[PDB]
Amino acid sequence: MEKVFYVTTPIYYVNAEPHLGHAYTTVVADFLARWHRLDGYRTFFLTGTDEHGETVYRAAQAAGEDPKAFVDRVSGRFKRAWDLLGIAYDDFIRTTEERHKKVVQLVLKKVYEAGDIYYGEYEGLYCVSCERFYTEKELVEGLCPIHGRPVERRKEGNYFFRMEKYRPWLQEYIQENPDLIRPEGYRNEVLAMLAEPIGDLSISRPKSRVPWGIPLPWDENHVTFVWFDALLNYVSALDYPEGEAYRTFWPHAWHLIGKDILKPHAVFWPTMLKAAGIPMYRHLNVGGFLLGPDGRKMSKTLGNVVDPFALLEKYGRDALRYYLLREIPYGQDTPVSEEALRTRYEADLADDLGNLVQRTRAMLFRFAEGRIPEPVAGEELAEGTGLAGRLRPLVRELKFHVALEEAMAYVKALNRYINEKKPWELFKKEPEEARAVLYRVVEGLRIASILLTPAMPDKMAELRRALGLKEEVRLEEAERWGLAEPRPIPEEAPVLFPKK
């Protein structure tokens, strides 16, 4: 009950084709959630889709579909992606949901009534012929993209949130809570962002331009624009006001994001929470870019894209997940490639794990009648029971790669052990000792398989089935020696990680 874990991924643009970036962030959240459930934490893992706005509406019109029907359909790509990646989220929040819309308006009203929202007029570029505003980006050589004529500077009104007002509080809060933003380098970048005025935040757009969105409670002619809509998913899914989920999980909120949305999460979101009278989140965990094989930012035209679904299809979900968690120090820009995945797949998995299980099964049939032998003390291998205590802080400090490295180091120790003891040689004069060695290798594997479960839950369950071990496990089970019972192993079993 005291052990509570709450983790969120950003909600993604609903019509985006899911790619490596979405996959990575969601996979890391999944690992964290599965790890905490395994360690007895009452946990809630949230993910979702950002469904309102001008862009999606443009998309729906182009598709000749009703906005609601369009997002109902395209939000399915993310749900399928998560199915493919084996993501066990507890809830999938869609901003079109009434439960979300109610919270957005409720918080808008609170912040408005607290005196933090005003109607301001900030000149913009306007084309009289189109009778519409245009951002600098949409102009063609500073001219209307339609009429090829100049545009005039007109003032447009929008509602703004007094964000600058909360800058001093945010600076102080970060100073007093140094582990709030992690990795540390991102904390420093945020403090640098806060070194100067941050201005106020545009939070709405007239409905005449953006009809697809949540109207402002005090002005139906304006719709909530991005920030107060999307960001609130983190509390709306918890039935925020007085829902039990909110009272229970919000005090432990961990948000995982890509560094691409650092400012909205480290600057905007905190001031919004402060103004709304909502407690600050516990941690903002910032991931880096997954660069292409060439060390450059991933992009279709550079031709350096790595497709997680194609990789997943070829090597399987578990191998991909393991690769992403092991190879990348969370927060640090890192190049990825099929070649690096393949390397990890053939050595760490097929060899250190697969071959060892294959060898162990063959040896159990030859020297132990096809059953796990009678339990015996672990001796040098008993140390494996202390690994969970070492990985707990590594995992919670976002050092997934180090945690996986230590779990795999033990697996390598199991290999070295069996290769040094040579049960097959010991069997002649000392059959009992040969059986003792094999027991230590199977019990060691049971332990390692538990530690690795959050990364490869399916393959680790498969590994346990291959050795006749109980499939369903708990992290604490990896902390005691001698749990593998002397039972029959399946007479046949597939190679855990077949050649590709």
129 contributes a contact to Zn ion by CB under 5 A: yes
Is 127 labelled as part of a ligand binding site? yes
User: Dihedrals φ, ψ of 359, to 5°?
Assistant: -65, -45
Nearer to Zn ion, 137 or 429 (CB): 137
Is 147 labelled as part of a ligand binding site? yes
Say whether 265 is catalytic: no
125 contributes a contact to Zn ion by CB under 5 A: no
Where are the strands (E) in 259-392, listed by range?
Answer: 283-287, 290-291, 334-335
Say whether 147 is catalytic: yes
Is 100 labelled as part of a ligand binding site? no
Binding-residue pattern over the window 418 to 457 for Zn ion, x denoting contact by CB under 5 A: ----------------------------------------
Nearer to Zn ion, 61 or 129 (CB): 129
| Residue appearing with tokens 């889709």 | 49
139 contributes a contact to Zn ion by CB under 5 A: no
Catalytic residue chosen out of the listed positions 36, 52, 144, 459: 144
3-state secondary structure of 93: strand
In sequence order, the 6+-apart residues with CB closer than 8 A to the CB of 472 are: none
DSSP 422: -
147 contributes a contact to Zn ion by CB under 5 A: yes
Q: Of the listed pieces 145-153, 272-280, 300-308, 385-393, which binds Zn ion according to CB under 5 A?
A: 145-153
Nearer to Zn ion, 147 or 487 (CB): 147
61 contributes a contact to Zn ion by CB under 5 A: no
Task: Using CB under 5 A, pick the residue from 88, 146, 310, 409 that binds Zn ion.
Answer: 146
Q: How far is the CB of 152 from Zn ion (least distance, A)?
A: 11
3-state secondary structure of 452: helix
Is 255 labelled as part of a ligand binding site? no
CA distances to 307, 320, 341 from 500, in Å: 17, 13, 12
Say whether 52 is catalytic: no
Rounded-to-integer distance, Cα 309 and Cα 282, Å: 32
Exposure string of 462-487, with b = 16+ CB inside 10 Å and e = fewer, is bbbebbbbeeebebebbbebebbeee
Say whether 127 is catalytic: yes
Q: Give the number of residues written for the chain.
A: 500
Is 300 labelled as part of a ligand binding site? yes
| Residue appearing with tokens 């097959």 | 424
User: Dihedrals φ, ψ of 45, to 5°?
Assistant: -115, 115
Whether the ω angle into residue 183 lies within 30 degrees of 0, i.e. cis, is yes
Q: How far is the CB of 143 from Zn ion (least distance, A)?
A: 9
Rounded-to-integer distance, Cα 491 and Cα 500, Å: 25
144 contributes a contact to Zn ion by CB under 5 A: yes
Strands of the sheet with 42-50, listed across from one edge? 91-94, 42-50, 4-13, 253-258, 283-287, 181-182
Task: Using CB under 5 A, pick the residue from 27, 56, 125, 127 that binds Zn ion.
Answer: 127
Catalytic residue chosen out of the listed positions 52, 100, 127, 274: 127
Strands of the sheet with 201-202, listed across from one edge? 117-121, 157-161, 201-202
Q: Of the listed pieces 43-51, 147-155, 165-173, 481-489, which binds Zn ion according to CB under 5 A?
A: 147-155
Say whether 22 is catalytic: yes
User: In sequence order, what DSSP letters do the residues of 298-309 get, joined into one string?
Assistant: --TTTT----HH
Q: Of the listed pieces 144-152, 168-176, 385-393, 436-444, which binds Zn ion according to CB under 5 A?
A: 144-152
Say whether 297 is catalytic: yes
Residue ranges that bind Zn ion, judged by CB under 5 A: 127, 129-130, 144, 146-147
Residues contributing to the annotated binding site? 127, 130, 144, 147, 300
Residues contributing to the annotated binding site for ATP? 300
Residues contributing to the annotated binding site for Zn(2+)? 127, 130, 144, 147
The residues carrying an active-site annotation are: 19, 22, 127, 130, 144, 147, 297, 300
